[PDB]
């Protein structure tokens, strides 16, 4: 996933960060807003090596005040490498406008 969208119909999403096993072992995750979280679901060190993170909203009320866009940064101090993914949160009392 290059960007993430969270809403009434997609309350979470599942992104894989790929890398080398040592870089994935020491992989931090940092959100630009406390209303958006990510947790590690599964690690694979077998090729192609990855970690699936389940990403989701902690508070739908923060997601109701407007389209909350933030970033989710995955970073590994062992290589000083980081990847930052946009996250849009949009929770709606939907119908015709």
């Amino acid at each position: 996933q290059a960007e993430i969208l969270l809403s009434n119909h997609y309350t979470s999403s599942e992104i894989r960060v790929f890398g080398a096993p040592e870089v994935l072992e020491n992989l931090e995750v940092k959100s630009g807003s406390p209303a958006v979280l990510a947790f590690a679901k599964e690690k694979s060190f077998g090729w192609p090596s990855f970690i699936t993170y389940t990403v989701g909203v902690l508070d739908p009320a923060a997601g109701s005040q407007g389209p909350l866009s933030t970033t989710l940064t995955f970073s590994s101090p062992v290589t000083n490498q980081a990847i930052a993914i946009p996250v849009t949160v949009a929770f709606v009392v939907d119908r015709r406008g």
Partner: protein, 288 residues
């Protein structure tokens, strides 16, 4: 318990409903029956171009038959019914003359005459809302997405407060308050009977031409007074509404109406004046 012992407090009103009830109902029906003649004229005066007058007339009818104009006409008919009903609370057969300046202040601060100025401010704000959606374009909505945010970072569609729609709504509130204040200050609520009774069509055909001339001048004074009021206070509703809804301000695309170099915009001033002419004419038609 306890419906007993007051039959004369029926009978005294029940004769008043025999004599006046159908006269009130006929007045309410005629107040609504003139509303299409006011809304057609409001669209035709807001759509004016001077180079393509065939398209001006074409597209004025394209809006007139549109389902959104039909809905706002049904809301505006309820507003005119309620204004016609408040003329039935507040009428006087003897003029409520203030024998001192303190008596005039005490008349304005009377709780029903205050209730009528709050309710007319609300009806003026709702009528200005209907008018601002009927004039479309930059007037149409209180909230607009930020018009320059090409700064890749945050795919959240950010939102700004539409200061021109706020100026429309707040002019409507000021006009409704001012009408209700004028209604008790001038004793417009007084019913002087005619020295010369006359058939209704002549009695109205003689007064409507004086009213449309009055509405055009009184709207121009109310917009002039509101422009002076906004130049000293506009920031207060503006900063309250931006904080209360967490809305931004597009200070790069729009000039703020706290500034004389935004507030002197002739297009806004014309459409807000025309809204005041529609407001005053429909409300004074119900009163007449």
């Amino acid at each position: 318990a306890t419906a007993v012992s007051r039959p004369c407090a029926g009978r005294s009103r029940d004769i008043l409903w025999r004599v006046l009830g159908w006269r009130i109902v006929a007045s309410i029906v005629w107040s609504v029956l003139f509303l299409p003649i006011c809304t057609t004229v409001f669209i035709i005066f807001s759509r004016i171009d001077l180079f393509h007058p065939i398209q001006w007339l074409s597209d004025s009818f394209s809006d007139l038959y549109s389902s959104y104009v039909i809905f706002y006409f049904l809301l505006l008919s309820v507003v005119i019914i309620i204004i016609s009903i408040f003329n039935v609370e507040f009428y006087a057969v003897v003029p409520s003359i203030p024998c001192s300046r303190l008596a005039l202040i005490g008349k304005i601060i009377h709780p029903q005459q205050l209730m009528h100025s709050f309710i007319h401010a609300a009806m003026g704000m709702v009528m200005a809302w209907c008018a601002a959606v009927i004039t479309q374009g930059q007037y149409s909505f209180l909230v607009v997405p930020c018009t320059g945010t090409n700064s890749f970072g945050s795919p959240a569609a950010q939102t700004c407060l539409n200061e021109y729609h706020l100026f429309f709504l707040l002019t409507g509130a000021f006009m409704g308050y001012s009408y209700s204040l004028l209604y008790f200050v001038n004793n417009m609520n007084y019913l002087p009977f005619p020295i010369i009774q006359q058939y209704k069509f002549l009695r109205f055909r003689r007064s409507l031409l004086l009213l449309v001339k009055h509405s055009c001048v009184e709207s121009l004074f109310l917009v002039r007074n509101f422009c002076i009021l906004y130049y000293f206070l506009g920031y207060i509703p503006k900063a309250w509404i931006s904080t209360a809804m967490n809305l931004h301000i597009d200070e790069q695309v729009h000039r703020p109406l706290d500034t004389v170099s935004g507030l002197l915009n002739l297009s806004l001033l014309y459409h807000v004046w025309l809204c005041g002419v529609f407001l005053l004419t429909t409300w004074y038609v119900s009163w007449i």
